[PDB]
Amino acid sequence: GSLKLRKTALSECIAIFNNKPKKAIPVLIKKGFLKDDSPISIAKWLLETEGLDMAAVGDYLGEGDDKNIAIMHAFVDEFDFTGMSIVDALRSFLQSFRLPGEGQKIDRFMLKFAERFVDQNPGVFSKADTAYVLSYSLIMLNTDLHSSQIKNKMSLQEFLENNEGIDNGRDLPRDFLEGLFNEIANNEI
């Protein structure tokens, strides 16, 4: 300093979180920014607070510990997917944190997402498993249309093929899948 910028108390706590998420929880409560360490309290703070590192958040929610799993479930429970297409729901969800690397962690996120989506949109799909597998196909499509340096763009035909049989052992309607394809094509997640 001695006259350099001072950080707010909240900004100091956010810095602690971004360095080590679990260390911030007992500090946020101590300082009154967090009511308690219940899954719902923590999940709400993650979603309400600006300036959190999305990779730090994703890694925290993705930890293979039952308490972190509970927080992640609460995090998904805060989303309102009612009336959204599965693409709009996925966009809202995946733009709020960075998915971790290991497949088993990803699967936890995507299964809970699928369950929440079907709970709030009864009659779109008969089974959460349909929304679950479709979500991976949509993530792959998103990558191949907008991000990939090592694959050509995925065609609509290929996207249809990739989802054969997923509706309780039957194909989804072509028009339904074409709609989702275009949603992804026109606005990257």
| Domain ranges for the chain | 1-81, 82-189
Measured between its terminal Cα atoms, the distance across the chain in Å is 42
Q: Which residues of 61-82 are buried (b: 16+ CB within 10 A; e: fewer)?
A: bbbeeeebbebbbbbbeebebe
d(CA 104, CA 107): 5
Site of tokens 């809970």: 112
By the 10 Å C-beta count (0-12 exposed, 13-18 middle, 19+ buried), 14 is classed as: buried
d(CA 23, CA 3): 29
- Extract the annotated binding site: 119
Q: What angle do CA 96, 174, 89 make, to 5 degrees?
A: 15
Q: What's the one-letter identity of residue 165?
A: G
CATH tag, 1-81: 1.10.220.20
d(CA 84, CA 81): 6
Distances from the Cα of 145 to the Cα of 46, 57, 63, 159, 160, angstroms: 30, 26, 30, 11, 15
Q: Please say whether the dihedral angle defined by the alpha carbons of residues 56, 57, 58 and 61, taken in this order, is positive or negative.
A: positive
Is residue 102 annotated as a catalytic residue, yes or no? yes
Q: Name the structure determination technique.
A: X-ray
Q: What's the one-letter identity of residue 167?
A: D
Q: Where are the alpha helices (DSSP H) in the chain?
A: 9-19, 21-30, 39-48, 54-62, 66-77, 86-94, 103-120, 128-146, 156-162, 174-186
d(CA 155, CA 85): 21
Question: Which one of the listed residues 102, 161, 178, 188 is annotated catalytic?
Answer: 102
Tell how far CA 11 is from the center of its chain: 24
The CATH superfamily holding the domain 82-189 is Arf Nucleotide-binding Site Opener,domain 2 (1.10.1000.11)
- Do the Cβ atoms of 124 and 163 come closer than 8 Å? no
SS3 98: coil
- Extract the annotated binding site for Mg(2+): 119
> Which resolution in angstroms does this entry have?
1.5
Classify 21 in phi/psi space as left (phi over 0), alpha (psi -120 to 50) or beta: alpha
